[PDB]
Symmetry: D2
Subunit: 295 residues, 4 copies
């Protein structure tokens, strides 16, 4: 037998960093959960229980704390680059570092219409993430994304014209509720190394912002009979607005809301045009995915 693959590292490293502006007195907070996995000439730890080739996970944790102390933790795309680069550069037997960052929301509070200098609210469970893969002599690969975005539109969504056979029972419809969680990932073009990445820093937040906006607006405005069709529209726009992205990927799990027939009770009318009360379903759920790249 032989080791075909191997990674090890620290997961769920919660980090919090505050930024204070001495002048204005305004404080800004950043809180993420970090995961670093190393790859390299570490087989013998597996085959001959050799720990000499092992950088302790505990130390990988220390390293995350120290790196965050001495560098900007935002955008996450930068921080992940800086961090993964450190691993390949400081150790001769480490050849690849895979950094995953999840950024949690700490929205500044508006008290009396003015933004509070140092008070935040977790205004949603939505997350902004990055998966940075820094490989030796192969550059830096960055996948950015947003996840945990939950939306619903009460109308302006239909589903008809789908295949029908002896397994079909679903009725066609020209008005329905559409609710989903959005998971949207945009892959950047390979970067040669840290410098190239620093050069593009402003593109990061911008693109995130753009991707969010596009998703929300398109979801709201599109009156479609295809979730597939809608996602694709989203993709296109993102690709159009940022040349440095190679692919865009969308995963939408479709949360269903069923009509409740109440006719059996005093001929109560609650379906079709009369539907008012529905039963949200916890499961199962449709799942639609797609990766869209350039022609």
């Amino acid at each position: 037998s032989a080791v075909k693959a191997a990674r090890y590292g620290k997961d769920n490293v919660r980090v919090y960093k505050v930024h204070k502006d001495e002048k204005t007195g305004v404080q800004t907070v950043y809180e993420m959960t970090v995961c670093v996995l190393l790859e390299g000439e570490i087989e013998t730890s597996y085959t001959k229980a050799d720990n000499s080739v092992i950088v302790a996970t505990d130390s990988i944790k220390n390293t995350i704390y120290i790196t965050a102390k001495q560098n900007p933790v935002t955008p996450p795309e930068l921080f992940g680059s800086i961090l993964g680069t450190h691993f390949i550069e400081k150790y001769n037997h480490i050849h690849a570092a895979h950094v995953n960052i999840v950024c949690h929301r700490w929205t500044r509070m508006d008290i009396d219409g003015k933004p509070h200098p140092h008070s935040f609210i977790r205004d949603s469970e939505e997350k902004r993430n990055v998966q940075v893969d820094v490989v030796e002599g192969k550059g830096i690969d960055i996948k950015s994304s947003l996840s945990g975005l939950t939306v619903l539109k009460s109308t302006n969504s239909q589903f008809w014209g789908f295949l029908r056979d002896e397994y079909t029972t679903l009725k066609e419809t020209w008005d329905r509720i559409l609710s989903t969680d959005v998971d949207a990932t945009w892959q950047w073009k390979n970067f040669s190394g840290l410098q190239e990445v620093r050069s593009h820093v402003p593109k990061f937040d911008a693109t995130w912002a753009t991707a969010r906006e596009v998703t929300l607006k398109t979801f709201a405005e599109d009156n479609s009979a295809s979730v597939q069709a809608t996602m694709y529209k989203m993709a296109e726009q993102i690709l159009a607005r940022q040349q440095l992205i190679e692919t865009v990927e969308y995963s939408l799990p479709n949360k269903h809301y069923f009509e409740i027939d109440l006719s059996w009770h005093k001929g109560l009318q609650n379906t079709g045009k009369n539907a008012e009360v529905f039963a949200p379903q916890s499961d199962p759920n449709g799942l639609i995915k797609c990766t869209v790249g350039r022609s």
Copy 2:
């Protein structure tokens, strides 16, 4: 042996209701999870396996759907009252109904600066709930509350002057991070029945909005060395701003952020006045509670 207590019913009934303005076109959505537990002359179902006295849990379900169909589901306090009352009135052997209602956020989206007619976002996992106890001959007891509000303030909190003994290792502090989930409950004065409730409808949404604003503002503005002191101030204002409320209750589960000493590494300074990076702690956590009523 004897039955000293007994309740049964249906839990986790998910309900969705839409409101359509034919004129303006604007739609509005309401989603909530409902639990209804009944009390009455049911012993015999326990003692002699007699099902005759049992209104099925499935029918309690149907009832919820039917009630929602034919009544306003907002405010929650009203809906809970209508629902509870239904049970004690329609059944001779049923003498108490306990209705729990958890309301989920479906905040209308702003596209391009304008509120969208029919598109919503789950803009937070915070919930607005109500526990409504409808007891025969005793009227209607309503507990209203907000939960799942998570907040953080990077400074303007201290802790010092606490009891010190042989079990004490905590160091006193004049600048610390304060984060907590907020669970706030205000109890209304007993209502005589459905009509007295209906008469007060406007106070419900109004009080909720007050309770929340007071909480947010006081948290942000108070620079205290007592979370206890802060919670108390919150209570006072709420009781002050609304005569019909008998008690206000707060439960704050603290979330600790620890300082990380990095001095062992190149004498890096990251504590006291230099603290920048902190370690968010998943557990354990402080838990402070208190019920405040009128003098």
Copy 3:
């Protein structure tokens, strides 16, 4: 305005303790989650921001570790009592201590038929808990319980003869699936103090064992048309087997498994006597509760 109530403390204190037997070389582990909430003359922390009356939550933490270090952590009823007692005894202004303990399963592993000296497996998400209320000059009240016990029986469960009216659509049945989580609490007769508690130590593990056995066996054996009727039988037996218990309380959340009509497809028969494939329902669910105590009759 005035403070009508007030409790503060530390929640979610995770604790693990190992016991070694130097002779046999066998090792035993205990892991629980602990919450301690204090009550007393502390109003001033709320009204006048006075921290002098506050034992810091961090110190409540240290105290749990230290107590765990110098005392048995089992049974949890004992530990909780020792722990609660400590707070009222060491502070003059603290009059009540409420300790909640959740015990986690770390079941010894059987390797090649033989119990392993030091290896364990989390063989289930069922918990054994205790709620211990130590109030000054009012003794020690103990509520013991098991939770997170999930069971299912594929048959020998019915539901018919229930009230029918204009809200009813449920069809009567003589064979159905019964699945539930079991939450069972037995409340002990008040104890004067730590001594009384120590004197009854053996009763603890035994009653827990009994409660669990009675629940499983009754559930399995009872062919009922009432979950209520089944819970009630369980209560009785527990009460019968232990005189020091004042009340038994059961809370069973009923998880439903629907029948799936497939007749629309090639006249497929999957209902009634031919039901084989069901759709388990995540929600909603029935919830049945009841507290049973001892009769005043003779």
Copy 4:
């Protein structure tokens, strides 16, 4: 822009199936959660909102129920294969089917030392899963696995001899607690079609059983100072005991238990040789992985 990749389907389909022995009276249950994702000539749904190429997710759900009704649902490897094969055979435009199945434990109850005919207990949150890829012309790829197996050994584990630099603070140790959730997967050698699979049916349950036993035994018995080392030994034995397996893959998320220094209190001894009470850490946690194959 162009559609580089696209799948869609039904997630979280809970299915329950009972087996009744008319002779013995003994019943047996099976509960699993199923996900089916289809791949094929479906681009147009994305690009031209064409639903004619879309087999409704609902119908995929109906199919799962139907298939379960007319086929064995055990071993999952088989069911998955039958299920995925159905999709590529019945639809001309569908060329891939990806079926995921999670199996929940419903262990038979021992009442008075005798196995009960129809009573079960969820005796663990440990799962047995399968991922079955059915690609037209490419055969059937099956990954089998066990997950959610949590274990802890109080002693007979050390960690010393690992790399030490300026980022290191971890002390070496000759006795330490070792706890971890185990996620173990074994990949089968490609099968040509449903028949080849049918022909190996018995190997499925047998290998699952072996994989489990090997993992428990090795974990218990191995006195190592390398989790990497231990994992490896587990994989070797699994490969050794079953020729049809191509690779075995372990993911071990290490759960830490810290020592608690209590010396500051009346010189209490609770470290090193005297360690009795420990603080289990919720996070962060080490994570070791590795894929082992044949030399």
